Write a protein that holds these residues in place. Structure first.
Motif, PDB file in Angstrom:
ATOM      1  N   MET A 276       8.254   3.440  -9.256  1.00 43.77           N
ATOM      2  CA  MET A 276       8.949   4.435  -8.731  1.00 43.77           C
ATOM      3  C   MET A 276       9.890   4.673  -7.128  1.00 43.77           C
ATOM      4  O   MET A 276      10.249   5.449  -7.126  1.00 43.77           O
ATOM      5  N   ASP A 277       9.104   3.825  -6.703  1.00 40.02           N
ATOM      6  CA  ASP A 277       9.719   3.826  -5.285  1.00 40.02           C
ATOM      7  C   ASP A 277      10.404   3.079  -4.616  1.00 40.02           C
ATOM      8  O   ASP A 277      11.232   2.599  -3.521  1.00 40.02           O
ATOM      9  N   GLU A 278      11.062   2.354  -6.226  1.00 37.44           N
ATOM     10  CA  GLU A 278      12.059   1.413  -6.007  1.00 37.44           C
ATOM     11  C   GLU A 278      13.576   1.154  -6.731  1.00 37.44           C
ATOM     12  O   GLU A 278      13.164   2.291  -7.781  1.00 37.44           O
TER      13      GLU A 278
ATOM     14  N   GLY B 192       1.398   9.131  -2.745  1.00 42.03           N
ATOM     15  CA  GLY B 192       2.701   9.552  -3.051  1.00 42.03           C
ATOM     16  C   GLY B 192       3.329  10.241  -4.117  1.00 42.03           C
ATOM     17  O   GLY B 192       2.996  11.635  -3.656  1.00 42.03           O
ATOM     18  N   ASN B 193       4.341   9.809  -4.318  1.00 41.16           N
ATOM     19  CA  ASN B 193       5.888  10.592  -4.981  1.00 41.16           C
ATOM     20  C   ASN B 193       5.306  10.755  -6.163  1.00 41.16           C
ATOM     21  O   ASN B 193       6.080  12.113  -6.983  1.00 41.16           O
ATOM     22  N   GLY B 194       3.899  10.439  -6.899  1.00 45.99           N
ATOM     23  CA  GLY B 194       4.080  10.474  -8.999  1.00 45.99           C
ATOM     24  C   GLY B 194       2.352  10.579  -9.015  1.00 45.99           C
ATOM     25  O   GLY B 194       1.597  11.573  -8.193  1.00 45.99           O
TER      26      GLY B 194
ATOM     27  N   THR C 217       1.216  -0.623  -0.091  1.00 40.57           N
ATOM     28  CA  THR C 217      -0.341   0.016   0.160  1.00 40.57           C
ATOM     29  C   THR C 217       0.945   1.151  -0.083  1.00 40.57           C
ATOM     30  O   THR C 217       0.411   2.349  -0.593  1.00 40.57           O
ATOM     31  N   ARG C 218       2.064   1.021   0.205  1.00 40.62           N
ATOM     32  CA  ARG C 218       2.683   2.717   0.525  1.00 40.62           C
ATOM     33  C   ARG C 218       4.425   2.258  -0.265  1.00 40.62           C
ATOM     34  O   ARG C 218       4.538   3.356  -0.103  1.00 40.62           O
ATOM     35  N   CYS C 219       4.067   1.468  -1.349  1.00 43.63           N
ATOM     36  CA  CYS C 219       5.553   1.526  -1.891  1.00 43.63           C
ATOM     37  C   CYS C 219       4.976   1.653  -3.732  1.00 43.63           C
ATOM     38  O   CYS C 219       4.481   0.615  -4.058  1.00 43.63           O
ATOM     39  N   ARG C 220       5.037   2.617  -3.879  1.00 47.31           N
ATOM     40  CA  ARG C 220       4.752   2.455  -5.855  1.00 47.31           C
ATOM     41  C   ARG C 220       5.676   1.798  -6.558  1.00 47.31           C
ATOM     42  O   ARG C 220       6.959   1.581  -6.582  1.00 47.31           O
TER      43      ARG C 220
ATOM     44  N   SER D 122      13.390  -1.668  -1.574  1.00 48.42           N
ATOM     45  CA  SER D 122      11.478  -0.915  -2.000  1.00 48.42           C
ATOM     46  C   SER D 122      11.056  -0.268  -0.831  1.00 48.42           C
ATOM     47  O   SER D 122      11.217  -0.590   0.626  1.00 48.42           O
ATOM     48  N   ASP D 123      10.990   1.450  -1.096  1.00 41.42           N
ATOM     49  CA  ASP D 123      10.662   2.190  -0.560  1.00 41.42           C
ATOM     50  C   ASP D 123       8.955   2.525  -0.035  1.00 41.42           C
ATOM     51  O   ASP D 123       8.526   3.343  -0.657  1.00 41.42           O
ATOM     52  N   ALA D 124       8.752   2.089   1.458  1.00 43.34           N
ATOM     53  CA  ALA D 124       7.591   1.911   1.480  1.00 43.34           C
ATOM     54  C   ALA D 124       7.697   2.814   2.625  1.00 43.34           C
ATOM     55  O   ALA D 124       6.333   3.236   4.139  1.00 43.34           O
ATOM     56  N   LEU D 125       8.418   3.904   3.102  1.00 37.77           N
ATOM     57  CA  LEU D 125       7.536   4.960   3.355  1.00 37.77           C
ATOM     58  C   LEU D 125       6.942   6.003   3.156  1.00 37.77           C
ATOM     59  O   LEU D 125       7.286   6.164   1.664  1.00 37.77           O
ATOM     60  N   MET D 126       6.152   6.617   3.428  1.00 37.68           N
ATOM     61  CA  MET D 126       5.056   7.925   2.914  1.00 37.68           C
ATOM     62  C   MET D 126       6.158   9.242   2.685  1.00 37.68           C
ATOM     63  O   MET D 126       6.916   9.633   3.319  1.00 37.68           O
TER      64      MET D 126
HETATM   65  K   LIG Z   1       6.630   4.867  -0.846  1.00 35.61           K
END
Ligand SMILES: [K+]
Ligand SMILES: Cc1cc2c3c(c1C)C(C)(C)C[C@@H](O)N3c1c(nc(O)[nH]c1=O)N2C[C@H](O)[C@H](O)[C@H](O)COP(=O)(O)O
Ligand SMILES: Cc1cc2c3c(c1C)C(C)(C)C[C@@H](O)N3c1c(nc(O)[nH]c1=O)N2C[C@H](O)[C@H](O)[C@H](O)COP(=O)(O)O
Ligand SMILES: O=C(O)c1ccc2ccccc2c1
Ligand SMILES: O=C(O)c1ccc2ccccc2c1
Ligand SMILES: [K+]
Ligand SMILES: [K+]
Ligand SMILES: [K+]
Ligand SMILES: [Mn+2]
Ligand SMILES: [Mn+2]
Lengths: 500, 500
Positions: free
Chosen positions: A423-425, B443-445, A417-420, A455-459
Motif C-alpha cells: 500500500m505505501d509502496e 496508517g493509510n489502510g 514501522t512506518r511503510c505498510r 517505499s514511503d515511510a512518511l506517516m
Molecule cells: K507510510
C-alpha cells in the motif's frame, strides 16, 4: 603537496594519523594482499601498505589496500574519506557529501598543464613491459583474472574534445598488453565509448592513472552530470587547479603526481573475457565470465617506488560502499532538490548493501504541497529512477525530519514501522535496473529492467497537520530535567569515551 | 527454590551474575524508575532493582526493571533470558528457543496444588487497598495511565474448566479497584473472554500474578497453541510440576511464590479508557485513548518485601523484542515444520522492530519439492499469516542455508541482495493485521487487515541445482590455509577478547 592533491602525501597522512600498517616483509599478490585487505575492511582496521610485494620488479609496484574504508572509532569513522578532501578527520558524512556537492554551483576551475611531474620518473615502452609479469593481485579466489584496476581513474574524452571524463570502472589483465573491463550503460565511460563507435574512425584514446590526487578519485567515484569534466569540478571543490602532464603516446592529460599511468586505447570493435569478480553486493558467481571492453596498453609511466591502490571489495565495508554508494546518494539529494522535491538529506544505508537510499523530507515543505503518498512516491521515483544518479539504487525510502538518514538503525526503524508493505509502496518495472545486484542479473526477471520501488515511510499526518507521535525512547518519552538527572546520577547509582 | 522456578531466586541470580544494580535511595515511580529502565534497555546495562520506591507502603512494592533485556557482552547477550530457563548464561538464541519449544511434543506435567506459599504472606481486602495509592509507575510521559501491568501474567480459564491460559497483556490503573487493559483478537485472553461473553451469565474469574516463576512468564509471552494450559507446558519444559495455591476469592490457582497477586473479575460488559501507551514498535500517539477491557480487583495478596517486575518498553531493546518477538518466531518455526515446510530456524530481527521473521530454508529439501518462488511464497504465507502465531509479523523473509537468521546483519544482507522488490514478493491483503504497528493502526489502510508480505530471498538455483555463488568475504573468497596464515600473523604485522 597536500594530502588531498597528491596520493603520496595521502599515504604519509595515513601513517601520521596512525591509520596505516606498513608490511615490509614479502606478501603474495596472489590472494594474500587482498585477504589482509578484506579482513581490514570487515573489521575497520588500519589501511595496509604492502612495501614488499612478491613479483615487484624495477619499482612496479607496492600496494595500498583499503584507501577509502572505515576507521574503528565512531569519532573519526570517516577519517580516510576526510583525508581525501582536506576535511578534519572527525568530519561527518553530511560534511563529506556537502564538500563533494559544493562544486555543483561553482564555476569549474580548469586544470593547469605542466611540462613534467613524478609520474614521468620511469617509463616502459611497448617492448619493455608485460602486464602478466607485474604483481597484479588476484583479489578473490574465484575471480576470472587479476584485477589491476580497482582504484585508478580511467580518462577518456569525447570525440569533439569538449568533455574529459574521469571515472572508476574495474579492469583485469587479459594478456601482456591488454586489459578487459566493465564498460556498461549508463556510465560515462560507456557514453563516450558510444560516441567514438558512432564516429567509427578510431579506437578511443585512453589513459588509466593509479594513485591520483585523492580529491580526484572521489570525483571519479561520483555521478556528477553528463558532459561535466571531473578535473574542473575537482578544481572548484578544492579551490585549486589540478596540475596535469600530457601522456607520451596520446594527447590526454594525467595528474602530474599519478603513481602509475597506463596509456593506450579502448577498442571500438574488440572484446574479451571479463569477470567474474567479487563485487560490491558481496558475491561472486564462479565461472560467470562475459565479454567486456578491451583496452590496449602502449606505455607505462610511473613514480619511483610506485604505489598501486587496491579495493578488496565485497561484503561490508569498502570503497564500493563508502564512496560509490554514498556519492550516488549525494547526487540523488541534489537531483531531488533541483526537481523542487523537499529532500534535505540522502544516504545509502550500509545495511542495504548500498541498494537503498533513504531520503529525508522537509515535512513543512511537504505539507505545503498538499499532496498524497501515492502522488509524491511516483514523483520522487520518476525523478530518481529515470536519471543516471539513480542507476545503482533499487529502493528509495522516504522518511520524515525526525530520522537521521546517516544512521542505518534509524532508517531501518522507520522503514519497518512506518511503510505498510504494498500500500505505501510504488513499484517501477519500466526503468533501468542495476544488473550487478544478484536478484537482477542472477534473478528471476530481466537483468536490466525494473525491480525498483519507492517505499514511503512518511506517516499520514506528515502530509497534512504534522507528526502526531512521540518516540517511546529515552530522548522523547521523558522530560529534559529528568533525563539530565538520570544521566548525572548514572555512574553514582552503579551503571556504566567519545574518542575511544 | 531455583531461579527459573522462583522470581525472588531469579533476582538473587541476577545479583550474583553481576547483572543487577540495587538502587537503595528514593526513586520516583512517576517516570524516574522507567527512565532509568529505558536507558538500561537502550544500552544493554544491568537490570535495575528499585528497593526504595517513593509511595511504597506496607510492603507494596519494589520494582525490578528490564527483567528480560540484553546484556552488553556478546558472550552472554541473552543471559537474562537463560536465567529464566535454567540454561547457562552463554546460551544462544537457538538454544533458548529450542528450550521454549521442547514441551510441544511432550506430555504436559500438570501443576501441583499446595496449601500456602509466600504470595499469602500479606493480604489486603476490598476495604484495605486503593490502586491509586500504590507506587504504580508512569512509564512514558504521554501514557494514558499508570501501567501497573507490564510483566505479570493474567490467569483466565475457559467456562468449562478445561483450559487455563497464562499470558502477558498490558493493563493500567482505572480507579481504586479497577484496571483497564488490552484484550484483542486473536489473543487467548480475548478468546476466553468471548467464551464467557457468549455464555452471558457472569464476568470472567481472573487473577493477575506479578513476579511469577521466570519459566512461567516466558510461556506467558509465547503463542503456544489454542487450548493448551501454559502451566502444564512449563511443567514439561522444566521437568517439574509447578506449585500453585488457590486464590482466596475465586477458584483460580496462582504460583505459590508470586510476588503480588490481584484477584477479581474481567467484565463481560464494561469497558473503560485505555492507553495510549509507549509500545513495542517504539511509538506513543498522545491522546489516542480507546475503550479497553475493564478488570475489577477484589483482593491483593503479596510476599513480604514484594518486587514488581516492569518492562519500560519502546525502542530497542526490551522484553517486547527479546521475548514476544523471539517466542513468536519460535512458534512460527514449529508451525512451518508441522505443515511440512522445510524451515530449520526462525527469528524476528531486532532491526525490523520484530515485525519481520526470517525463515531459514533447508534448500536440499526445497530442491526435492521441485517448486517455484511464487508457489513456495504463497504456501509459506498461507500457513503463517492465517495462524495466530503469525499475528504480529508483517514480513516473512525466506533465506537459504548460508544465512544465520539470528544475525540481523546477515538477514539484511540477504534481503537487500537476493529479493527483487515486487517480483520476488507476495502481498497478503486478506489476513489479520497487527494494528499496533504504526503503519497499520495509524496508517493509510485498514488497521486490522492486510499489509503483509512474503519476501523470497532464495536465489533461483536454490530451487533447482544448488547455490551458484561464493560470498566476496574473508571467509569464502580465500582458501583455508591462507585465512589461517593471515589470522596467525595479524597482530605480528601490526593490526588489532570473546568474553569482554
Ligand atoms: K507510510
Ligand atoms: C568506488 C568504486 C566505484 C566503482 C567500482 C569500484 C570502486 C572501488 C570497483 C572496486 C573497481 C568495483 C567496480 O565494480 N566499480 C565499477 C564502477 N562503475 C562501473 O561502471 N564499473 C565498475 O566496474 N564503480 C562506480 C563508478 O565509479 C561510479 O558509478 C561513477 O559515478 C562513474 O563515473 P561517471 O560515469 O559518472 O563519470
Ligand atoms: C513480553 C510482552 C508481551 C506482550 C506485551 C508486553 C510484554 C512485555 C507489554 C510490555 C505488557 C506490552 C504489551 O503490548 N504486551 C501485550 C501483549 N499481548 C497482548 O495481547 N497485549 C499486550 O498488551 N504481549 C504479547 C503476548 O504476551 C503474546 O502474544 C502471548 O503469546 C500471549 O499469550 P497467548 O494469548 O498466546 O496465551
Ligand atoms: O564490480 C563492482 O563491484 C561494481 C561496483 C559498483 C558499480 C557501480 C556502477 C556500475 C558498476 C559497478 C560495478
Ligand atoms: O503494548 C504493547 O507494546 C504490545 C506489545 C506486544 C503485543 C503483542 C501482541 C499483541 C499486543 C501487543 C501489545
Ligand atoms: K565520475
Ligand atoms: K501464552
Ligand atoms: K529471490
Ligand atoms: Mn562523469
Ligand atoms: Mn495461551
Amino acid at each position: 603537496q597536500p594530502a588531498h592533491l597528491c596520493f603520496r602525501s595521502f599515504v604519509e597522512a595515513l601513517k601520521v594519523d596512525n591509520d596505516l600498517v606498513e608490511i615490509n616483509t614479502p606478501i603474495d599478490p596472489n590472494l594474500e594482499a587482498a585477504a589482509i585487505t578484506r579482513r581490514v575492511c570487515e573489521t575497520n582496521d588500519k589501511a595496509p601498505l604492502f612495501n614488499n610485494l612478491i613479483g615487484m620488479k624495477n619499482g612496479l609496484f607496492r600496494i595500498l589496500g583499503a584507501p577509502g574504508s572505515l576507521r574503528k572509532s565512531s569519532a573519526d569513522r570517516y577519517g580516510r574519506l576526510a583525508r581525501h578532501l582536506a576535511l578534519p578527520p572527525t568530519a561527518s558524512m553530511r560534511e563529506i557529501l556537502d564538500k563533494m556537492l559544493s562544486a555543483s554551483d561553482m564555476p569549474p576551475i580548469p586544470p593547469t598543464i605542466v611540462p613534467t611531474g613524478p609520474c614521468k620518473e620511469n617509463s616502459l615502452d611497448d617492448s619493455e613491459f608485460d602486464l602478466t609479469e607485474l604483481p597484479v593481485p588476484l583479489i578473490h579466489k574465484s575471480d576470472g583474472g587479476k584485477y589491476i584496476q580497482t582504484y585508478g581513474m580511467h580518462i577518456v574524452q569525447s570525440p569533439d574534445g569538449t568533455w574529459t571524463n574521469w571515472s572508476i570502472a574495474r579492469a583485469m589483465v587479459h594478456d601482456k598488453n591488454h586489459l578487459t573491463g566493465l564498460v556498461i550503460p549508463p556510465q560515462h565511460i560507456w557514453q563516450i565509448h558510444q560516441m567514438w563507435k558512432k564516429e567509427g574512425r578510431s579506437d578511443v584514446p585512453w589513459a588509466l592513472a593509479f594513485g591520483v590526487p585523492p580529491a580526484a578519485i572521489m570525483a571519479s567515484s561520483m555521478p556528477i552530470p553528463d558532459g561535466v569534466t571531473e578535473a574542473g569540478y575537482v578544481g572548484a571543490m578544492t579551490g585549486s587547479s589540478l596540475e596535469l602532464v600530457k601522456c607520451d603516446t596520446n594527447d590526454l592529460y594525467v595528474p602530474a603526481t599519478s603513481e602509475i599511468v597506463l596509456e593506450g586505447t579502448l577498442s571500438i570493435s574488440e572484446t574479451g573475457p571479463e569477470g567474474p569478480f567479487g563485487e560490491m553486493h558481496g558475491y561472486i558467481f564462479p565461472g560467470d565470465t562475459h565479454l567486456g571492453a578491451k583496452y590496449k596498453v602502449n606505455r607505462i609511466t610511473y613514480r619511483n617506488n610506485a604505489i598501486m591502490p587496491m579495493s578488496s571489495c565485497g561484503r561490508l565495508t569498502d570503497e564500493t560502499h563508502t564512496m560509490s554508494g554514498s556519492l550516488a546518494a549525494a547526487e540523488i539529494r541534489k537531483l531531488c532538490q533541483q526537481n523542487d522535491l523537499p529532500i534535505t538529506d540522502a544516504f545509502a544505508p550500509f545495511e542495504s548493501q548500498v541498494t537503498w537510499v533513504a531520503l529525508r523530507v522537509d515535512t513543512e515543505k511537504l505539507r505545503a504541497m498538499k499532496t498524497t503518498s501515492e502522488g509524491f512516491r511516483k514523483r520522487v521515483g520518476d525523478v530518481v529512477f529515470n536519471h543516471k544518479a539513480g542507476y545503482t539504487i533499487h529502493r528509495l525510502v522516504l522518511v520524515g525530519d525526525d530520522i537521521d538518514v546517516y544512521e542505518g538503525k534509524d532508517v531501518l526503524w522507520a522503514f519497518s514501522t512506518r511503510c505498510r508493505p504494498g500500500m505505501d509502496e510504488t513499484l517501477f518495472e519500466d526503468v533501468r535496473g542495476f544488473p550487478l545486484i544478484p536478484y537482477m542479473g542472477h534473478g528471476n526477471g530481466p537483468a536490466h529492467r525494473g525491480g525498483k520501488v519507492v517505499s514511503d515511510a512518511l506517516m499520514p499526518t506528515e502530509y497534512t497537520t504534522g507528526r502526531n507521535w512521540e518516540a517511546a525512547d529515552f530522548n522523547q518519552s521523558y522530560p529534559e530535567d529528568l533525563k539530565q538527572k538520570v544521566l548525572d546520577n548514572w555512574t553514582k547509582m552503579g551503571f556504566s569515551h567519545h574518542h575511544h
